[PDB]
Each structure stands twice: as structure tokens, then as C-alpha cells.
Amino acid sequence: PSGKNPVMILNELRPGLKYDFLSESGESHAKSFVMSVVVDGQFFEGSGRNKKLAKARAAQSALATVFNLHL
Numbered sequence: 320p321s322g323k324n325p326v327m328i329l330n331e332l333r334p335g336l337k338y339d340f341l342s343e344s345g346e347s348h349a350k351s352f353v354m355s356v357v358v359d360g361q362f363f364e365g366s367g368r369n370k371k372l373a374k375a376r377a378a379q380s381a382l383a384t385v386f387n388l389h390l
């Protein structure tokens with residue numbers, strides 16, 4: 320990431336996407352919350368200690384792919 324938190328970029332850019340909110344990538348002790356995105360006919364999952372990081376992971380994956388598509 321650069322300029323902002325990556326969630327915020329993917330948010331601003333939002334090319335045509337939708338978010339799913341999932342719990343459960345664990346561990347059962349300090350936790351992972353899971354964010355799924357569907358974008359350009361493409362699908363990603365990102366596991367983070369909360370949405371500020373789950374979305375960051377999901378965003379980062381999507382960002383890399385779709386920006387390689389130039390989309």
C-alpha cells in the first residue's frame with residue numbers, strides 16, 4: 320500500500336465490486352475476520368484481525384490483480 324490504508328483505496332476506486340463479511344480464519348485466541356470480494360469476474364478472500372486488515376488483505380489481492388488488468 321501507499322498514500323492511504325489499502326481498504327480506503329479499494330473503496331475509492333470500487334471498479335464494480337461487492338464485499339462479503341465472513342468470520343473464521345482463526346486462531347481461536349486473537350482471531351481472524353475474513354473479507355471476500357467479487358470484482359471483474361474475479362474472487363478474493365482476505366483474513367485479518369479485523370475488517371481494517373481483512374479488507375486490507377482482500378483489497379491488496381484484488382488491487383494487484385485488477386490493476387494488472389488496468390481495471
